[PDB]
């Protein structure tokens, strides 16, 4: 019911060449937008951090960038219930937009008339890529020429979706409830550690309207990898 | 260090199909093994949960299967620190081997060298399961050819990997430290939930050795065919 800037592009503020990436996709499509300076380890993070959530300041199972990542994202919550919007739409600096963004991104009326913005619900915009994903190891020797390589737990999702003011109070509060117990980084809340029952819920538009485009080429070079892998053994046992 | 069995395969006792086709595998590369008496929707089964991990008991956002299922890793567990193993490997009854499994499997000194196992950590052995993530129906109007489906459960493969003693604890008190709050099934806790923190790490052994008997033909059937709405 509103035209107060709602899309929000959270970059380093002197990211320059993400930024100009950025600025020329929106522009093309005719969409408007604000960028978001990422807080990064400095004064004015650790200020906000024990100001807001000191939990997390103790917290060390968490790197700084992965704090200021938080803050970024929590602080851009708070402002949908400062300015009493309905919903607002964030991203990351390093994302890539579908074709017909603008009639998701320009109007925002088939959201009024699909959802009850105070309900608690996210709309992930991002295509859906694997919260599971591996790096080569250099500390442990690969045996019979296979390498041991780390599984991490990235939920890459928070790089583009809609959050309802609803969803934006939960959060907000939810973030607060926490001291270093269950503080893990920001995907492995929103959309894995609560998928399981409390009322809010997350829907994942699809197909999806962008993309982090390194995430899917590296999601797609393991899977090409891990599929041809399953061939050749179920070949093997054919004997 | 010991030669004690450490290769164990989950599996319902009856499921003789199963069993020989493992037996088959195990035997052709010559790699010690024992089964392993998986829980079934049963008073043994019952018995053991609220004996063990109440709040599972109570926990009915899982099927019995699921229960039967953790339970077997758990116990498995359990006996890896029972009889002061330094690591234990586990197996569902519906995996196929790829070439060099013996040399993995048939000895252990190539992880001697490699690890510390009483740090935690995990190696998995298997292929990746697919699909990772499920999605519903939402009953929502698709805008501009797009649906808005609601996103459900994650699922990985837990039909083998190497635990460690240290992570045989790790998990075991983990388990017993949840009241049906984050009580999700067992692949969605161990390599999903729980890489994230505590210094619990995993590893993934690449290329694999191993894979779920008909992942191939649902992967396939995956690419091949959708659904509409």
Not at 184 to 201: L, W
Request: aromatic share 10%; net charge negative; glycine share 2%.
């Amino acid at each position: 019911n509103s035209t107060e800037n709602k899309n929000f592009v959270i970059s380093i503020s002197t990211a320059e060449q993400r930024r100009n990436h950025i600025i020329e996709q929106f522009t093309h499509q005719n969409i408007p937008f604000e960028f978001f300076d990422a807080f990064t380890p400095s004064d004015k993070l650790t200020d906000h951090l024990q100001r807001y959530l000191p939990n997390v300041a103790n917290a060390a199972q968490l790197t700084m960038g992965e704090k200021g990542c938080l803050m970024s994202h929590f602080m851009l919550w708070k402002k949908c219930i400062d300015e009493n919007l309905d919903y607002i739409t964030l991203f990351e600096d390093d994302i890539l937009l579908g074709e017909n963004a603008n009639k998701f991104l320009a109007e925002g009326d088939w959201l009024k008339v699909r959802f009850n913005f105070q309900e608690i619900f996210v709309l992930r915009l991002e295509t859906f890529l694997m919260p599971v994903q591996l790096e080569k190891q250099t500390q442990i020797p690969p045996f019979q020429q296979r390498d041991i390589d780390i599984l991490t737990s990235k939920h890459f999702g928070t790089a583009g979706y809609v959050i309802s003011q609803g969803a934006a109070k939960y959060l907000i509060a939810l973030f607060e409830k926490l001291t270093t117990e269950e503080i893990k980084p920001i995907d492995e809340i929103m959309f894995n550690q609560q998928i399981n029952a409390t009322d809010y819920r997350v829907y994942q538009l699809n197909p999806a309207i962008c993309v982090q485009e390194l995430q899917l080429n590296q999601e797609a070079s393991l899977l090409v990898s891990n599929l041809e892998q399953e061939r050749k053994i179920n070949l093997k046992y054919e004997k």
